[PDB]
Amino acid sequence: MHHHHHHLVPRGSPSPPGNLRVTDVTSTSVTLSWEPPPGPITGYRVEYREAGGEWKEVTVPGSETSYTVTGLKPGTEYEFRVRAVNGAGEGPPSSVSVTT
């Protein structure tokens, strides 16, 4: 076995979002909810991909705590991760799995 990859992040960047969870799923949409980590937050990167492929991304407001990704393919395995951002850079992600 090899050790796990470390997420390299700038000192001063935020902790991961807390309590990340999927709060609604339809055959073409996924709603995420979370809580802000401590300190200044300037935004959140919401990243997602069909498991195994290429990652899409949307950045949402620092004041946001829920967001719905629409236009997804039915019956599909997805991976989502959310990273908090501030002036020092982006922090480590918290991730969840979903299927539509």
Residue numbers in the entry: 1 to 100
Quote the study's own text.
We selected the fibronectin type III (FN3) domain, a small β-sheet sandwich of roughly 90–100 amino acids in length, due to its ubiquitous nature across phyla, and its popularity as a model for protein folding and engineering studies. This paper describes the structural and biophysical characterization of FN3con—a consensus-derived FN3 domain having increased stability. We generated the new protein sequence using the consensus method, which selects the most frequently observed residue at each column of the sequence alignment.
In order to understand the structural basis for stability in FN3con, we determined its X-ray crystal structure to 2.0 Å resolution. FN3con adopts the FN3 fold, consisting of seven anti-parallel β-strands connected by surface exposed loops. A structural alignment with our comparison domains shows very high similarity, with an average root mean square deviation (RMSD) of 1.2 Å across backbone Cα atoms in all structures. Analysis reveals FN3con to have the highest number of H-bonds and salt bridges, with the smallest accessible surface area (ASA). Interestingly, FN3con harbors a unique and extensive complementary charged electrostatic network that is distributed over β-sheet 2, spanning strands C′, C and F. This network results from the presence of four arginine residues and four glutamic acid residues (R45, R49, R81, R83, and E47, E57, E79, E90), which are not present in any of the other FN3 domains. The most striking observation from these calculations is the significantly reduced solvent inaccessible cavity volume of FN3con (60.8 Å3) compared with the next most stable domain, Fibcon (171.0 Å3). All assessed FN3 domains contain the highly conserved tryptophan 22 (W22), while FN3con further contains a unique solvent-exposed tryptophan (W55) on β-sheet 2. W55 packs tightly against the side chains of E47, R49, E79 and R81; however, its effect on stability is not immediately apparent. The hydrophobic core of FN3con is highly regular, exhibiting uniform banding of hydrophobic residues.
